[PDB]
Amino acid sequence: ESIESITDNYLFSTSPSQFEKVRDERPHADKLDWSSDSCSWAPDKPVGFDFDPACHRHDFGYRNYKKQSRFDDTSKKRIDDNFYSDLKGICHGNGSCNALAWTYYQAVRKFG
């Protein structure tokens, strides 16, 4: 019932496409930041796949962990790794898409 527990359920207990349907309703928007850049920082996007749910969830984790004053390095790694998992799941074995998923993951690991 704590806002931090709710945040963590959205991050870690939903698929990315379910997260996106949660985000559409902006639950608890009095406490949570639902804004996202949709990976506008990535010059290359995959053709034929939509990474936006994963990007939205990654931004949700960074922005809300920072607002909640609990953005430690291990949580950052958890959120980054969850983002890579989301992207790999969207790619479902497509090699070109996987190559982009790795580059997005490396971008957040090194420049996040």
mmCIF file of C-alpha atoms in Angstrom:
data_model
loop_
_atom_site.group_PDB
_atom_site.id
_atom_site.type_symbol
_atom_site.label_atom_id
_atom_site.label_comp_id
_atom_site.label_asym_id
_atom_site.label_seq_id
_atom_site.Cartn_x
_atom_site.Cartn_y
_atom_site.Cartn_z
ATOM 1 C CA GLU A 1 0.000 0.000 0.000
ATOM 2 C CA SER A 2 3.121 2.192 0.346
ATOM 3 C CA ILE A 3 3.824 4.227 -2.750
ATOM 4 C CA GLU A 4 7.269 2.633 -2.974
ATOM 5 C CA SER A 5 5.775 -0.861 -2.997
ATOM 6 C CA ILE A 6 3.273 0.193 -5.676
ATOM 7 C CA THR A 7 6.126 1.651 -7.740
ATOM 8 C CA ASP A 8 8.013 -1.640 -7.431
ATOM 9 C CA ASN A 9 5.002 -3.683 -8.498
ATOM 10 C CA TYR A 10 4.665 -1.628 -11.656
ATOM 11 C CA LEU A 11 8.390 -2.020 -12.360
ATOM 12 C CA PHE A 12 8.950 -5.666 -11.549
ATOM 13 C CA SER A 13 5.663 -7.571 -11.541
ATOM 14 C CA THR A 14 4.258 -6.559 -14.984
ATOM 15 C CA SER A 15 5.201 -7.327 -18.596
ATOM 16 C CA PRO A 16 6.145 -4.209 -20.543
ATOM 17 C CA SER A 17 2.916 -4.211 -22.510
ATOM 18 C CA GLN A 18 0.945 -4.485 -19.258
ATOM 19 C CA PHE A 19 3.013 -1.630 -17.801
ATOM 20 C CA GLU A 20 2.006 0.464 -20.796
ATOM 21 C CA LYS A 21 -1.699 -0.184 -20.113
ATOM 22 C CA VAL A 22 -1.164 0.784 -16.455
ATOM 23 C CA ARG A 23 0.658 3.941 -17.517
ATOM 24 C CA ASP A 24 -2.319 4.925 -19.709
ATOM 25 C CA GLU A 25 -4.437 5.379 -16.567
ATOM 26 C CA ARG A 26 -1.764 7.335 -14.645
ATOM 27 C CA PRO A 27 -2.464 5.675 -11.273
ATOM 28 C CA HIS A 28 -1.308 7.590 -8.218
ATOM 29 C CA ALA A 29 -0.306 10.538 -10.399
ATOM 30 C CA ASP A 30 -0.393 12.739 -7.292
ATOM 31 C CA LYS A 31 2.812 10.974 -6.187
ATOM 32 C CA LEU A 32 4.281 9.360 -9.346
ATOM 33 C CA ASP A 33 5.914 10.887 -12.385
ATOM 34 C CA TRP A 34 4.572 9.172 -15.514
ATOM 35 C CA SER A 35 6.623 11.243 -18.000
ATOM 36 C CA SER A 36 9.027 9.593 -20.390
ATOM 37 C CA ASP A 37 11.310 10.466 -23.298
ATOM 38 C CA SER A 38 10.435 7.153 -25.102
ATOM 39 C CA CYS A 39 14.203 6.619 -25.684
ATOM 40 C CA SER A 40 14.352 9.797 -27.772
ATOM 41 C CA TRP A 41 18.067 9.717 -26.809
ATOM 42 C CA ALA A 42 18.615 6.647 -29.071
ATOM 43 C CA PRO A 43 19.487 7.611 -32.675
ATOM 44 C CA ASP A 44 18.711 4.106 -34.051
ATOM 45 C CA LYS A 45 15.296 2.485 -33.552
ATOM 46 C CA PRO A 46 14.330 -1.064 -34.544
ATOM 47 C CA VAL A 47 12.214 -1.356 -37.651
ATOM 48 C CA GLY A 48 9.276 -3.631 -37.053
ATOM 49 C CA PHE A 49 9.421 -3.564 -33.241
ATOM 50 C CA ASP A 50 8.226 -1.042 -30.646
ATOM 51 C CA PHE A 51 10.603 -0.458 -27.737
ATOM 52 C CA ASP A 52 8.428 2.309 -26.277
ATOM 53 C CA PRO A 53 6.888 0.253 -23.442
ATOM 54 C CA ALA A 54 10.340 -0.724 -22.254
ATOM 55 C CA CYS A 55 11.580 2.858 -22.468
ATOM 56 C CA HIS A 56 8.564 4.145 -20.600
ATOM 57 C CA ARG A 57 9.170 1.628 -17.823
ATOM 58 C CA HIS A 58 12.885 2.464 -17.584
ATOM 59 C CA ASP A 59 12.134 6.182 -17.233
ATOM 60 C CA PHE A 60 9.455 5.380 -14.687
ATOM 61 C CA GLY A 61 12.020 3.546 -12.570
ATOM 62 C CA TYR A 62 14.718 6.198 -12.736
ATOM 63 C CA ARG A 63 12.402 9.138 -12.266
ATOM 64 C CA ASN A 64 10.428 7.696 -9.372
ATOM 65 C CA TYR A 65 13.351 6.121 -7.546
ATOM 66 C CA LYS A 66 14.967 9.552 -7.654
ATOM 67 C CA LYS A 67 11.814 11.297 -6.415
ATOM 68 C CA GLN A 68 11.537 8.700 -3.632
ATOM 69 C CA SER A 69 15.190 9.194 -2.688
ATOM 70 C CA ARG A 70 16.162 5.566 -3.174
ATOM 71 C CA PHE A 71 18.092 5.568 -6.443
ATOM 72 C CA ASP A 72 21.073 3.555 -5.277
ATOM 73 C CA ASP A 73 23.457 1.839 -7.701
ATOM 74 C CA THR A 74 22.019 -1.650 -7.151
ATOM 75 C CA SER A 75 18.485 -0.406 -7.871
ATOM 76 C CA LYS A 76 19.813 1.312 -10.986
ATOM 77 C CA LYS A 77 21.295 -1.964 -12.093
ATOM 78 C CA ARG A 78 18.038 -3.773 -11.390
ATOM 79 C CA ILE A 79 16.094 -1.243 -13.477
ATOM 80 C CA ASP A 80 18.681 -1.339 -16.277
ATOM 81 C CA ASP A 81 18.707 -5.124 -16.351
ATOM 82 C CA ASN A 82 14.906 -5.223 -16.331
ATOM 83 C CA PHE A 83 15.008 -2.855 -19.322
ATOM 84 C CA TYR A 84 17.305 -5.209 -21.214
ATOM 85 C CA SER A 85 14.987 -8.106 -20.367
ATOM 86 C CA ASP A 86 12.011 -6.091 -21.641
ATOM 87 C CA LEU A 87 13.819 -5.294 -24.895
ATOM 88 C CA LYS A 88 14.947 -8.880 -25.471
ATOM 89 C CA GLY A 89 11.394 -10.037 -24.932
ATOM 90 C CA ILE A 90 10.118 -7.550 -27.532
ATOM 91 C CA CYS A 91 12.749 -8.687 -30.020
ATOM 92 C CA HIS A 92 11.834 -12.393 -29.519
ATOM 93 C CA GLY A 93 15.041 -13.709 -31.081
ATOM 94 C CA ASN A 94 15.387 -11.254 -33.966
ATOM 95 C CA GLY A 95 19.130 -10.741 -34.258
ATOM 96 C CA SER A 96 19.139 -7.144 -35.501
ATOM 97 C CA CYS A 97 16.653 -6.169 -32.819
ATOM 98 C CA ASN A 98 18.819 -7.921 -30.215
ATOM 99 C CA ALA A 99 21.843 -5.953 -31.353
ATOM 100 C CA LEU A 100 19.920 -2.723 -30.770
ATOM 101 C CA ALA A 101 18.649 -4.034 -27.397
ATOM 102 C CA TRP A 102 22.282 -4.528 -26.320
ATOM 103 C CA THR A 103 23.222 -1.023 -27.450
ATOM 104 C CA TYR A 104 20.301 0.527 -25.537
ATOM 105 C CA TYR A 105 21.283 -1.455 -22.442
ATOM 106 C CA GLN A 106 24.915 -0.385 -22.734
ATOM 107 C CA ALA A 107 23.852 3.225 -23.183
ATOM 108 C CA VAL A 108 21.963 3.243 -19.883
ATOM 109 C CA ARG A 109 24.663 1.244 -18.053
ATOM 110 C CA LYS A 110 27.408 3.652 -19.055
ATOM 111 C CA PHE A 111 25.569 6.967 -19.526
ATOM 112 C CA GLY A 112 22.359 6.532 -17.456
#
